[PDB]
Amino acid sequence: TNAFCSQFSRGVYAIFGFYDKKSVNTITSFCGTLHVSFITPSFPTDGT
Amino acid sequence: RKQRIEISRRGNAGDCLANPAVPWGQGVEIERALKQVQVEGLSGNIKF
């Protein structure tokens, strides 16, 4: 969350990063809310 | 309160995303309290 918000304040157009099964919902929720795009090599989210 | 420890340094304005994050120490003493208290509720013997 901290890193993400720092990036947002920095004014990034997109964010590439890794996530965990503990961290997946944070990323999905915040990216679905702030409409910032997220690129990940990690496992695919369950559902849409 | 029976232990007469001070519960709060400041009443309002704390920031959650501060980098690096400042944990208020008194919070720990809260955690302990909640953990060490035992009472009779609708569930049965309530002990943690």
Swiss-Prot record, chain A:
Q: This protein is called what? A: Glutamate receptor 2
Note the residue range shown relative to the complete protein: 74 to 121 of 883
Domain remarks: The M4 transmembrane segment mediates tetramerization and is required for cell surface expression.
Annotated gene? Gria2
On assembly, the entry states: Homotetramer or heterotetramer of pore-forming glutamate receptor subunits. Tetramers may be formed by the dimerization of dimers. May interact with MPP4. Forms a ternary complex with GRIP1 and CSPG4. Interacts with ATAD1 in an ATP-dependent manner. ATAD1-catalyzed ATP hydrolysis disrupts binding to ATAD1 and to GRIP1 and leads to AMPAR complex disassembly. Interacts with GRIP2. Interacts with GRIP1. Interacts with NSF via its C-terminus. Interacts with CACNG2, PICK1 and GRIP2. Interacts with GRIA1 and SYNDIG1. Part of a complex containing GRIA2, NSF and NAPA and/or NAPB.
Its taxonomic placement starts with: Eukaryota, Metazoa, Chordata, Craniata, Vertebrata
**In which organism is this protein found?**
Rattus norvegicus
**In what way is this protein post-translationally modified?**
Palmitoylated. Depalmitoylated upon L-glutamate stimulation.
Its UniProt miscellaneous note says:
The postsynaptic actions of L-glutamate are mediated by a variety of receptors that are named according to their selective agonists. This receptor binds AMPA (quisqualate) > L-glutamate > kainate.
* Tissue-wise expression: Detected in forebrain. Detected in dendrites of neuronal cells. Expressed in the pyramidal cell layers of CA1 and CA3 and in the granule cell layer of the dentate gyrus.
Query: Any idea where this protein resides?
Result: Cell membrane; Postsynaptic cell membrane; Postsynaptic density membrane
The UniProt family comment states: Belongs to the glutamate-gated ion channel (TC 1.A.10.1) family. GRIA2 subfamily.
**UniProt function note:** Ionotropic glutamate receptor that functions as a ligand-gated cation channel, gated by L-glutamate and glutamatergic agonists such as alpha-amino-3-hydroxy-5-methyl-4-isoxazolepropionic acid (AMPA), quisqualic acid, and kainic acid. L-glutamate acts as an excitatory neurotransmitter at many synapses in the central nervous system and plays an important role in fast excitatory synaptic transmission.
What domain of life is recorded for the organism? Eukaryota
Q: What induces it?
A: Down-regulated in the pyramidal cell layer of CA1 in the hippocampus by global ischemia.
Curated annotation (Swiss-Prot), chain B:
Q: What is known of its domains?
A: The M4 transmembrane segment mediates tetramerization and is required for cell surface expression.
Q: How is it modified after translation?
A: Palmitoylated. Depalmitoylated upon L-glutamate stimulation.
Full protein stretch here: 315 to 362 of 883
Q: Could you tell me in which tissues this protein is expressed?
A: Detected in forebrain. Detected in dendrites of neuronal cells. Expressed in the pyramidal cell layers of CA1 and CA3 and in the granule cell layer of the dentate gyrus.
> Which organism's genome codes for this protein?
Rattus norvegicus
This entry's comment on induction and repression of expression is: Down-regulated in the pyramidal cell layer of CA1 in the hippocampus by global ischemia.
Subunit record text: Homotetramer or heterotetramer of pore-forming glutamate receptor subunits. Tetramers may be formed by the dimerization of dimers. May interact with MPP4. Forms a ternary complex with GRIP1 and CSPG4. Interacts with ATAD1 in an ATP-dependent manner. ATAD1-catalyzed ATP hydrolysis disrupts binding to ATAD1 and to GRIP1 and leads to AMPAR complex disassembly. Interacts with GRIP2. Interacts with GRIP1. Interacts with NSF via its C-terminus. Interacts with CACNG2, PICK1 and GRIP2. Interacts with GRIA1 and SYNDIG1. Part of a complex containing GRIA2, NSF and NAPA and/or NAPB.
Write down the superkingdom of origin: Eukaryota
Gene of this entry: Gria2
Function, as annotated, reads:
Ionotropic glutamate receptor that functions as a ligand-gated cation channel, gated by L-glutamate and glutamatergic agonists such as alpha-amino-3-hydroxy-5-methyl-4-isoxazolepropionic acid (AMPA), quisqualic acid, and kainic acid. L-glutamate acts as an excitatory neurotransmitter at many synapses in the central nervous system and plays an important role in fast excitatory synaptic transmission.
Q: Which family, according to UniProt?
A: Belongs to the glutamate-gated ion channel (TC 1.A.10.1) family. GRIA2 subfamily.
Q: What else is known?
A: The postsynaptic actions of L-glutamate are mediated by a variety of receptors that are named according to their selective agonists. This receptor binds AMPA (quisqualate) > L-glutamate > kainate.
Protein name, UniProt field: Glutamate receptor 2
Protein location: Cell membrane; Postsynaptic cell membrane; Postsynaptic density membrane
